[PDB]
Amino acid sequence: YLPPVPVSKVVSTDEYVARTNIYYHAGTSRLLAVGHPYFPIKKPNNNKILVPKVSGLQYRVFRIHLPDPNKFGFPDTSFYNPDTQRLVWACVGVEVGRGQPLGVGISGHPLLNKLDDTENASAYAANAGVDNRECISMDYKQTQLCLIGCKPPIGEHWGKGSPCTNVAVNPGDCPPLELINTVIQDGDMVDTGFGAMDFTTLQANKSEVPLDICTSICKYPDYIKMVSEPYGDSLFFYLRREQMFVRHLFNRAGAVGENVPDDLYIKGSGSTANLASSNYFPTPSGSMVTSDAQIFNKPYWLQRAQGHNNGICWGNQLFVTVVDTTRSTNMSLCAAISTSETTYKNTNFKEYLRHGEEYDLQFIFQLCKITLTADVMTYIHSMNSTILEDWNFGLQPPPGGTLEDTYRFVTSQAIACQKHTPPAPKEDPLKKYTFWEVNLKEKFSADLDQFPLGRKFLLQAGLKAKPKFTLGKR
Amino acid sequence: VSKVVSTDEYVARTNIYYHAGTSRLLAVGHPYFPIKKPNNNKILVPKVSGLQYRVFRIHLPDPNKFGFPDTSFYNPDTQRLVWACVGVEVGRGQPLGVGISGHPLLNKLDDTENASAYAANAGVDNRECISMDYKQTQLCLIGCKPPIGEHWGKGSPCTNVAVNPGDCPPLELINTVIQDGDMVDTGFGAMDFTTLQANKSEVPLDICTSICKYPDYIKMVSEPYGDSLFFYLRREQMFVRHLFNRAGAVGENVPDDLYIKGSGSTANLASSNYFPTPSGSMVTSDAQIFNKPYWLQRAQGHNNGICWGNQLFVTVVDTTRSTNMSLCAAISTSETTYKNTNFKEYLRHGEEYDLQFIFQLCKITLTADVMTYIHSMNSTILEDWNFGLQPPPGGTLEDTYRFVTSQAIACQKHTPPAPKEDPLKKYTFWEVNLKEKFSADLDQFPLGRKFLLQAGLKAKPKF
Amino acid sequence: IKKPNNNKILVPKVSGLQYRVFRIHLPDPNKFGFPDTSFYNPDTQRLV
Amino acid sequence: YIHSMNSTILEDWNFGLQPPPGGTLEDTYRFVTSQAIACQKHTPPAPK
């Protein structure tokens, strides 16, 4: 309804939204974490962990919340009746601080699938034995990237799907592969260049790769999928950098999975008629870091983006994804169980492994208003109705009469508390999805000049009315 | 627009007033329990006492059907008519006197008011025959939605600790619609004794099975439209009389550090539980809230005396008339030497109210906002009106006739399901029909002329 | 009510005879949105 | 007069120091945790 008829050409978010005259910033200072690089340290008898597995290799998701435009007001509001009009945060600019010293903590595995070196063969190697696996480590591809939007980022991975049923499933068959997209979660594992997939399922050996990735299913972001969003709300911006190069050239150790056609060579003799393993694998090697590759510690100013979405954070909500390989340093240390004896005894000493983390979030914001027609209300509810859930705004559809309400009696009880300890209604439909959280809703300064970040923005766009305290000469 | 508005906005007041009312009421029953044939489940006598609550559902006929001496002043197309309730009365004819109740086996230890010596040891089944008076109370409740009560009750405990037999059940606050026949508080609080009291002897008969309930003014008035009640009045009083003990195994011992260990007779701790004996006080002719007119102009809710769906509610409870007349019949009229074996004893109990209602007539103009706002409030209202349409279906049907002719066309007629109108039909309670009783004159009635007297403008023919 | 060996309360002691204090916080009105705030200056002024 | 009455009042507002400059200019905010190994943010007492 309303007079004209439903033409299908979308509006881009700077159509209806209006940019206010006023700006803000707040944010947390920093964060830490420690952890063991390889695996979590737990109470051995229990299943509960004393320590989680932690590394820079872990995708770190971050989700931030903002105060209500209606409840949280501001020094000059003059421009709106809350009846017909509402307000929304807009994200003009973003920072990421990283304060660690830069270095690599690497990793490896105590049993690695390996056969031989293919680089220079001075003799024909032996034949497949029983469990020749060995203890080997490797560096990883270096990577830096940043992700910003109101919907979570969406990665992808390989997986084993169900094959169409023809060949009777035989243990040891080559399993079918399938390419699967999924939401990114916290603690998730960067690719090593060995691909986003499930090793533990798809590799029965489990010894093919270092511990960290062997456990989990690594994921990789899809620009194709994500940016495809005709809203732009998944992500309206990003940057990325990565590098890799080859180091060593090896063979797999195990029974040949799928045989080589013999017509591809000429028949051998002695042990040369015995085909050594044809499965080769490269050795990824991280490269030299630099000071200038950092995509961090530097301001960005995001005005136009690829989607209709322009810098709008719907539902008081904003996301950031961060990937750094530079700070991956894992420090080693030991405490001696006996400090008496003056002779060095490896048994006296238990070496220990911990890892650092540091982070910053500092967020400019510009406030914004919406004028409401049904047309407006149509699209958004059409777009996503949940935004007309939390925010009525003030209104259900333009009648928007109240609900003959339930006003809550749960406030304290007799130890009944299923007025809910099985908690309150609605949800985050993504609440199941684990990832890290911070509330800023308390922090906002009314003027920027207090902070190092902001004044840059005052500097960047220049000062219209420069701060004047009538000090200095009069 | 959101945010409910004062009904006097869109409603307009007319120039016409009407009156109707029942002739009267007179009720008889047994106070303590209902009577039924011993083998049968059918009631021989219904249980009746003043202590029981009284609900009154009062229908009105749709005024839009009610032709006026001049109907021209409105258009039946664009508009409707809905009744406004200006003023309300409650008649009571019984002579004022107080009833009473008790129980033949009452859990009791001893008198705690004065003790010259430490008590004895609890035996088995020391319960006694003792009675007490209930708190005096008067209240009145008026509105277009059912009066909302509340009570304590047992909820589902947290599942952590395994409940052993005799453990303390957790407690819960439970709203419900108020039903007729339910019991006033005795001062023992609104809850279900049946569930939370296994002894069944902890209170006098009348309330033992039922659930005493009490109106929660907050949640009631908390309704946005006020349609639960737009008005009320309340009076009650109580004072203490006796001080007793519960007799039974102690559920939870007192921490010893709260006292000093005794010895001999003082070694055993007497029952810790005390419960009061509530007492009604002197009744008076002055505090009666009945037999006197009321005038409802402005209420707490945005609803101003608007009765939606031709429906209006009255909830009235009083203990002042609780008088229980006792009577006796003789099984043998011969002997002149009296014998207690000769007489059967019975208890019957009277009840009398009366109802007279003013009404004012009101028209509603429509727009979309109007139509929606109501439909927002309660859409069932428009159903009883003629607006909301609702195109029907129905292209074709195949009648095959005839069916009892047993060449089989299928087996067929399945659509009774919607005589159903009252959603509260599950709730049984007192009923009255005024629909016939309207009249267009306030002069011929005792009540009405006061309405004129108050607002003035006596207008009567000449003689 | 408390577990007999424990020091932790099983049930809180409650009776009408107990006094009741109520502390009531308000949020700072100097952060708080008004349909029109221009009637004052947040610099030279305050709100309580 | 206010500072006479109760000085703690001026703290909760702005107005940290007597005429119109502003600021408590040593360093302010810090957090050392997230997940649980290192001895918690609450090993130090609550200052406020």
Curated annotation (Swiss-Prot), chain C:
Post-translational modification, as annotated: ISGylated by host HERC5, this results in dominant-negative effect on virus infectivity.
Cell compartment(s), UniProt: Virion; Host nucleus
Subunit field text: Self-assembles into homopentamers. The capsid has an icosahedral symmetry and consists of 72 capsomers, with each capsomer being a pentamer of L1. Interacts with the minor capsid protein L2; this interaction is necessary for viral genome encapsidation. Interacts with protein E2; this interaction enhances E2-dependent replication and transcription activation. Interacts with host KPNA2; this interaction mediates the nuclear localization of L1 capsomers. Interacts with host ITGA6. Interacts with host SDC1; this interaction promotes efficient infection of keratinocytes.
General function of this protein: Forms an icosahedral capsid with a T=7 symmetry and a 50 nm diameter. The capsid is composed of 72 pentamers linked to each other by disulfide bonds and associated with L2 proteins. Binds to heparan sulfate proteoglycans on cell surface of basal layer keratinocytes to provide initial virion attachment. This binding mediates a conformational change in the virus capsid that facilitates efficient infection. The virion enters the host cell via endocytosis. During virus trafficking, L1 protein dissociates from the viral DNA and the genomic DNA is released to the host nucleus.
Remaining remarks: HPV16, in comparison to HPV types 6 and 11, is more often associated with malignant genital cancers in humans.
Protein family membership: Belongs to the papillomaviridae L1 protein family.
Name by which UniProt lists this protein: Major capsid protein L1
Included stretch of the parent chain: 52 to 99 of 505
